[PDB]
Amino acid sequence: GSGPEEEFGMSLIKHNSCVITTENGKFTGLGVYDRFVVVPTHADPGKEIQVDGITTKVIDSYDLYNKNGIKLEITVLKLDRNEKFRDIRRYIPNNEDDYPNCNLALLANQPEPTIINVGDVVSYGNILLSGNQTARMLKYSYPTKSGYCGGVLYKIGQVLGIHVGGNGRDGFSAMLLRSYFT
Ligand SMILES: Oc1cc(-c2ccccc2)nc2ccccc12
What we know:
With 182 residues, the protein is mainly β. The chain has one helix at 4-16; strands spanning 17-22, 25-33, 36-40, 48-51, 54-57, 60-65, 71-78, 99-106, 114-125, 136-141, 152-155, 158-166, 170-175. A hairpin with a 2-residue loop joins strand 11 (152-155) and strand 12. Residues 144-146, 148-149, 165-168, 171 line the site of 2-phenylquinolin-4-ol. The PDB classes it as hydrolase.
């Protein structure tokens, strides 16, 4: 920027993100409201986790699912925090959409907080090996790494997804909708 779309991302990292450590590694977490943090399901959190290096007891844990009952691959954790997150629910869209020129906000496994321009983002159907109960993720062409896991997909005034997967060429985010949190 620097740059309203970087300032936005940087402030989001600063005030709402954390590094969640589990037996599976380090993931970026996003505090949404109250003491709820969203983290990739693959982090596979125990009864206790580490938040920015500090052992925290997870009270409740909720796997998120779409309209057709397919797991999003993000889970919501109720933490033992101080403390309360500034409610960012208003930046989360209500419905699916495609989004031109998005960024990715990364904290975990990075030297310092990082903003990556991932380019244009399109919804893409999950590929199913059984049935036709569809699910979408937000896809982008960018060689993402497994260390980006948990990263926040955003644009100014919009918190759009959580980075959860990739194949070397494309990255994929779990599509965030406000109704998952209200
Ligand atoms: O963005 C990602 C990319 C890859 C990945 C997979 C195969 C080759 C190169 C990179 N693997 C990932 C694993 C977990 C979370 C995110 C990931």
